[PDB]
Design an enzyme around this catalytic site. Sequence first.
Site, PDB file in Angstrom:
ATOM      1  N   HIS A  76     -97.088 -47.226 -15.927  1.00  0.00           N
ATOM      2  CA  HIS A  76     -98.414 -46.707 -15.611  1.00  0.00           C
ATOM      3  C   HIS A  76     -99.190 -47.663 -14.696  1.00  0.00           C
ATOM      4  O   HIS A  76    -100.339 -48.052 -14.951  1.00  0.00           O
ATOM      5  CB  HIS A  76     -99.173 -46.286 -16.879  1.00  0.00           C
ATOM      6  CG  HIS A  76    -100.274 -45.313 -16.599  1.00  0.00           C
ATOM      7  ND1 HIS A  76    -100.876 -44.571 -17.588  1.00  0.00           N
ATOM      8  CD2 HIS A  76    -100.869 -44.944 -15.438  1.00  0.00           C
ATOM      9  CE1 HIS A  76    -101.812 -43.805 -17.057  1.00  0.00           C
ATOM     10  NE2 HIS A  76    -101.825 -44.004 -15.753  1.00  0.00           N
ATOM     11  N   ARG A  95    -100.060 -37.166 -15.978  1.00  0.00           N
ATOM     12  CA  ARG A  95    -100.298 -37.589 -17.349  1.00  0.00           C
ATOM     13  C   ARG A  95     -99.038 -37.434 -18.182  1.00  0.00           C
ATOM     14  O   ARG A  95     -98.329 -36.412 -18.086  1.00  0.00           O
ATOM     15  CB  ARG A  95    -101.452 -36.798 -17.950  1.00  0.00           C
ATOM     16  CG  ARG A  95    -102.801 -37.226 -17.405  1.00  0.00           C
ATOM     17  CD  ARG A  95    -103.277 -38.449 -18.157  1.00  0.00           C
ATOM     18  NE  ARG A  95    -104.504 -39.051 -17.650  1.00  0.00           N
ATOM     19  CZ  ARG A  95    -104.563 -39.939 -16.667  1.00  0.00           C
ATOM     20  NH1 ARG A  95    -103.466 -40.316 -16.029  1.00  0.00           N
ATOM     21  NH2 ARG A  95    -105.735 -40.463 -16.338  1.00  0.00           N
TER      22      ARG A  95
HETATM   23  N1  LIG Z   1    -100.367 -42.594 -12.581  1.00  0.00           N
HETATM   24  C1  LIG Z   1    -101.553 -43.038 -12.159  1.00  0.00           C
HETATM   25  O1  LIG Z   1    -101.743 -44.228 -11.992  1.00  0.00           O
HETATM   26  C2  LIG Z   1    -102.640 -42.038 -11.876  1.00  0.00           C
HETATM   27  C3  LIG Z   1    -103.725 -42.443 -11.083  1.00  0.00           C
HETATM   28  C4  LIG Z   1    -104.750 -41.545 -10.816  1.00  0.00           C
HETATM   29  C5  LIG Z   1    -104.718 -40.261 -11.355  1.00  0.00           C
HETATM   30  N2  LIG Z   1    -103.675 -39.891 -12.136  1.00  0.00           N
HETATM   31  C6  LIG Z   1    -103.633 -38.534 -12.678  1.00  0.00           C
HETATM   32  O2  LIG Z   1    -103.438 -37.642 -11.608  1.00  0.00           O
HETATM   33  C7  LIG Z   1    -104.212 -36.472 -11.825  1.00  0.00           C
HETATM   34  C8  LIG Z   1    -104.424 -35.682 -10.542  1.00  0.00           C
HETATM   35  O3  LIG Z   1    -105.348 -36.358  -9.707  1.00  0.00           O
HETATM   36  P1  LIG Z   1    -106.089 -35.629  -8.488  1.00  0.00           P
HETATM   37  O4  LIG Z   1    -107.181 -36.515  -8.066  1.00  0.00           O
HETATM   38  O5  LIG Z   1    -105.135 -35.183  -7.458  1.00  0.00           O
HETATM   39  O6  LIG Z   1    -106.705 -34.350  -9.219  1.00  0.00           O
HETATM   40  P2  LIG Z   1    -107.596 -33.140  -8.688  1.00  0.00           P
HETATM   41  O7  LIG Z   1    -108.173 -33.467  -7.340  1.00  0.00           O
HETATM   42  O8  LIG Z   1    -108.474 -32.750  -9.834  1.00  0.00           O
HETATM   43  O9  LIG Z   1    -106.495 -32.005  -8.449  1.00  0.00           O
HETATM   44  C9  LIG Z   1    -105.804 -31.475  -9.565  1.00  0.00           C
HETATM   45  C10 LIG Z   1    -104.833 -30.428  -9.048  1.00  0.00           C
HETATM   46  O10 LIG Z   1    -104.097 -29.949 -10.194  1.00  0.00           O
HETATM   47  C11 LIG Z   1    -104.143 -28.533 -10.186  1.00  0.00           C
HETATM   48  N3  LIG Z   1    -104.094 -27.968 -11.549  1.00  0.00           N
HETATM   49  C12 LIG Z   1    -104.879 -28.259 -12.636  1.00  0.00           C
HETATM   50  N4  LIG Z   1    -104.602 -27.505 -13.679  1.00  0.00           N
HETATM   51  C13 LIG Z   1    -103.580 -26.662 -13.236  1.00  0.00           C
HETATM   52  C14 LIG Z   1    -102.866 -25.612 -13.850  1.00  0.00           C
HETATM   53  N5  LIG Z   1    -103.066 -25.238 -15.129  1.00  0.00           N
HETATM   54  N6  LIG Z   1    -101.933 -24.982 -13.125  1.00  0.00           N
HETATM   55  C15 LIG Z   1    -101.715 -25.340 -11.845  1.00  0.00           C
HETATM   56  N7  LIG Z   1    -102.335 -26.318 -11.179  1.00  0.00           N
HETATM   57  C16 LIG Z   1    -103.277 -26.932 -11.918  1.00  0.00           C
HETATM   58  C17 LIG Z   1    -105.436 -28.151  -9.488  1.00  0.00           C
HETATM   59  O11 LIG Z   1    -105.440 -26.782  -9.057  1.00  0.00           O
HETATM   60  P3  LIG Z   1    -106.673 -26.228  -8.178  1.00  0.00           P
HETATM   61  O12 LIG Z   1    -106.549 -26.862  -6.791  1.00  0.00           O
HETATM   62  O13 LIG Z   1    -106.494 -24.714  -8.176  1.00  0.00           O
HETATM   63  O14 LIG Z   1    -107.965 -26.702  -8.859  1.00  0.00           O
HETATM   64  C18 LIG Z   1    -105.517 -29.214  -8.400  1.00  0.00           C
HETATM   65  O15 LIG Z   1    -104.761 -28.788  -7.261  1.00  0.00           O
HETATM   66  C19 LIG Z   1    -105.459 -37.008 -12.518  1.00  0.00           C
HETATM   67  O16 LIG Z   1    -106.160 -35.983 -13.230  1.00  0.00           O
HETATM   68  C20 LIG Z   1    -104.879 -38.077 -13.440  1.00  0.00           C
HETATM   69  O17 LIG Z   1    -104.511 -37.477 -14.679  1.00  0.00           O
HETATM   70  C21 LIG Z   1    -102.647 -40.727 -12.376  1.00  0.00           C
END
Ligand SMILES: NC(=O)c1ccc[n+]([C@@H]2O[C@H](COP(=O)([O-])OP(=O)(O)OC[C@H]3O[C@@H](n4cnc5c(N)ncnc54)[C@H](OP(=O)(O)O)[C@@H]3O)[C@@H](O)[C@H]2O)c1
Lengths: 317, 317
Positions: free
Chosen positions: A280, A232
Amino acid sequence: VRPPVLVDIKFNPEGVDRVLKTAFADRGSINLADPANRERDFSETEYALLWKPDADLFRRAPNLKVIFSGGAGVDHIIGMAGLPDIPIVRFVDRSLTTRMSEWVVMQCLMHLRGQYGHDSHQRRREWAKLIAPEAAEVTVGVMGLGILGQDAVAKLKVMGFNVIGWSRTRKTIEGVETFDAGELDRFLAKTDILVGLLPLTPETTGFYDSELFKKLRRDGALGQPVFINAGRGKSQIETDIVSAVREGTLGGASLDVFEVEPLATDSPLWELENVFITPHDAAVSEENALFRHVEMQIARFERGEPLQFVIDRAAGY
Amino acid sequence: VRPPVLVDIKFNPEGVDRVLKTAFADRGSINLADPANRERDFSETEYALLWKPDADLFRRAPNLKVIFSGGAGVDHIIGMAGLPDIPIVRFVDRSLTTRMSEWVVMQCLMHLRGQYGHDSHQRRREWAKLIAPEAAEVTVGVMGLGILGQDAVAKLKVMGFNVIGWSRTRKTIEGVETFDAGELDRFLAKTDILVGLLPLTPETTGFYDSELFKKLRRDGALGQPVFINAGRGKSQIETDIVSAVREGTLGGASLDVFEVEPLATDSPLWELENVFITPHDAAVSEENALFRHVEMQIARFERGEPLQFVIDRAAGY
Ligand SMILES: NC(=O)c1ccc[n+]([C@@H]2O[C@H](COP(=O)([O-])OP(=O)(O)OC[C@H]3O[C@@H](n4cnc5c(N)ncnc54)[C@H](OP(=O)(O)O)[C@@H]3O)[C@@H](O)[C@H]2O)c1
Ligand SMILES: NC(=O)c1ccc[n+]([C@@H]2O[C@H](COP(=O)([O-])OP(=O)(O)OC[C@H]3O[C@@H](n4cnc5c(N)ncnc54)[C@H](OP(=O)(O)O)[C@@H]3O)[C@@H](O)[C@H]2O)c1
Ligand SMILES: [Cl-]
Ligand SMILES: [Cl-]
Ligand code: NA
Ligand code: NA
């Protein structure tokens, strides 16, 4: 007869309308974009598919059983007033995941291999061999080890990078050193290319800043460390990215996400040396994939099976 | 006391001299670049490490047991008069292989993802989302399934591409459809991105031409097929690449190798849309790696073990 699904997705209205024609075929949908639904009774409504929903939606639909996020983050809904105490289901999809890894691997390789220099010389008709270390000499530090981070780690390792990971709770990944929240400084000091795949939460807002960039590895195989973010945009401080690149704290960056989107025309990021900008479009959420996901999770729920990909409400993601 | 190794490598003379100081420590070397070796007796010489060797070398050193190629091809020696009927050992190296795969995967991803368009818009401060199919919707056809081709196939598959292969004799690769020499037309018709990793032989000289480009898949997920070559430049007809791109037969190209190197300043390839040029730096041969390889193969040979990576003299590679 099951009640129709409420749909309030504030993006691509004509596309949403078209794709809804073939969705939810056993019950239909209530598209909140349609003026004919201004007075609609939502008392029977069980499921709501929401992306930047109307602030009064939960007053209108007080008997919802499940909220489905209409995009791949939940930061658009998680902070709003009156959000009910019911499961909120993330949108996740295999094609989205594998496309994020394509982007991540491509960006890491372009930094490793000197794509910026190659392109610059090509445009000037200059033959100019570049030196690049093999991937194994470079450590990629992946921040976020969720659905996207885990896939990226696996593929970066196959390409030959040394990979380490950081997440809020340490995640076990066979063959990859992984660190928990409090070990951030140690993790940063080991990292040559930072790959950001974090959700947006209060804790991750303005997280990638000057102080953080100065903790990245300074004596590594790329010379200067690199910052990559496709999580993000509000997680980074763009003026600090610009300063860090200008000062040589960062050797370069790749960014798919920005504090304000679209990225302002006058942003210094566009013309900054060794910086790659994508608008994006690393791994966008798409309507058919979204609706198939929601339909499937409803099918599970109506068999009495657990919903998948339910957010941690207290954690905020 | 074993005789010194003969070294005649016509590239980077000062680097060769420096790196030889720590090579072959049990016997030494005879560097043919040194004027003090103009009259040297080579009658005891057993091993020769050659890259574009002097034409009279085999008359001077008639008792050679093994020739070692001083670069990652043998086209620089295979056709020369008086080449003795002794084993010719290719230079191969794990770091070279993995670096070729970095380049190949990066180029395939940049075509898949629209790097040319992204870069063009970035330079103009234009926010412009692009559509790209996931890798699984695109077939990469790898021509050459040797050391480099096999590694590239494996890594492209991990990234999600559909991958097929073509080689002179069909090569068995679990999970990948592979074709033999005579099936070229069928293979081309299935291929969206052609990846060229062939040696230069008479059979592969001027092989990538107009007729070949017109056989690539026309109705695939990229719209127009793409040509990638990192084998040898004399395998392609550059004027046909230029015509094919201009006419829309090819949607783009990535080239590390050229008919004449350095690529002429006035080549149309430099400014051609959707074409990426690297200056023959995908996976260069390096002196320490070369000498370690040769030293190892000598150690094997002197135990009576087989030399590895011996070329097929009749086949010419
Ligand atoms: N650019 C794009 O087109 C695009 C597309 C899709 C998604 N995204 C973004 O990518 C993000 C991640 O996606 P995902 O599916 O991989 O998410 P996810 O499965 O929810 O995993 C999020 C990861 O971030 C970690 N995290 C969250 N808060 C944290 C903190 N304060 N300190 C350290 N680590 C923290 C979590 O730790 P834990 O394992 O301990 O819970 C988890 O490992 C989405 O939420 C979205 O914002 C971007
Ligand atoms: N750009 C760079 O920096 C760079 C670096 C290193 C090497 N190279 C080039 O890359 C080439 C390939 O390297 P490699 O180690 O993978 O070679 P390799 O192990 O010798 O494999 C060569 C492959 O090409 C196939 N082939 C040869 N002649 C053919 C023909 N007439 N028709 C169909 N297939 C044919 C072979 O078929 P079979 O399997 O049936 O024998 C084999 O699969 C080198 O020879 C060199 O020219 C370039
Ligand atoms: Cl700024
Ligand atoms: Cl031309
Ligand atoms: Na600043
Ligand atoms: Na032409």
